[PDB]
Amino acid sequence: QQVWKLVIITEEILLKKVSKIIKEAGASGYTVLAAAGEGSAYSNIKFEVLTASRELADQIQDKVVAKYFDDYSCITYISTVEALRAHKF
Amino acid sequence: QQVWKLVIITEEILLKKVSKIIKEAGASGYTVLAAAGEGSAYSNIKFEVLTASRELADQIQDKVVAKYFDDYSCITYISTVEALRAHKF
Amino acid sequence: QQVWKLVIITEEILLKKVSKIIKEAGASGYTVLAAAGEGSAYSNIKFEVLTASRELADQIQDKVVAKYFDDYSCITYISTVEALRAHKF
């Protein structure tokens, strides 16, 4: 049984705004790490959001991209994982 | 040639206990990152353990879940990677 | 459409040297996280580099391994992701 993992790497100023999008979309949780990077090196944030459906991962990704992709640094992608143990998913 | 990657995100108080489980099971190493998150946002820890067999990844995951899943925050999952270069695996 | 994700976990002293290899090879960016670990627990660094081709991921991995694998702690691997949104890739 595959589940989906959405990653969003973006500017630290978006921590609250992106966390709200994740929770309002119905994700059961999220993990965020402090990171740094260079793109198109400075401190930024990396979100990981596990979802039971591709649709939910897409909905979160699409909302973040629609709101912030044009005005903020951002990279995002999805992959699959298995053998999930979670308290509420 | 695929190898396995076990992820365990759990409470920081379990750092030593989970590290011991990983090493006693025979993993060749582990990586741990400081993180934060929300689940079922506060600081926590994310372990990544690469293993040569699914069996070893399962054994570590099963022991952590059996010991701590009922009493501590925890999410865990497995995925595959390739092109491994490691000193001892 | 799959894209590739190269991970390199290595000693913090190599931060600049590995960042230079990544950029000189033509990657569009990279992310780096502070981590800790044990191998063959101390602070180290984890790079993640997304690439449009397996060839580019291999070229970066091969250069890092050729330069530093014999003299420094290092583990590296590759996996795939999808649903990429990036500003320049």
Ligand SMILES: Nc1ncnc2c1ncn2[C@@H]1O[C@H](COP(=O)(O)OP(=O)(O)O)[C@@H](O)[C@H]1O
């Ligand atoms: N090819 C890549 N591999 C890994 N991480 C990347 C890559 N490209 C961008 N990133 C990450 O995403 C962040 C944002 O990138 P981007 O939106 O291109 O603008 P910026 O150059 O301001 O970082 C970077 O700081 C980096 O952390």
Ligand SMILES: Nc1ncnc2c1ncn2[C@@H]1O[C@H](COP(=O)(O)OP(=O)(O)O)[C@@H](O)[C@H]1O
């Ligand atoms: N759907 C999810 N996606 C990403 N990370 C998650 C998810 N659910 C939980 N987590 C991570 O696992 C941690 C533990 O979650 P959980 O055991 O549900 O309880 P808690 O609410 O105390 O965090 C969270 O703090 C978060 O880091």
Ligand SMILES: Nc1ncnc2c1ncn2[C@@H]1O[C@H](COP(=O)(O)OP(=O)(O)O)[C@@H](O)[C@H]1O
């Ligand atoms: N099996 C593994 N799973 C996850 N991370 C690992 C594993 N083996 C090594 N690592 C990571 O790579 C780093 C370097 O490992 P290695 O080169 O074997 O030497 P060291 O023992 O000096 O760390 C470790 O500190 C750890 O972060």
Ligand SMILES: [Cl-]
């Ligand atoms: Cl990570």
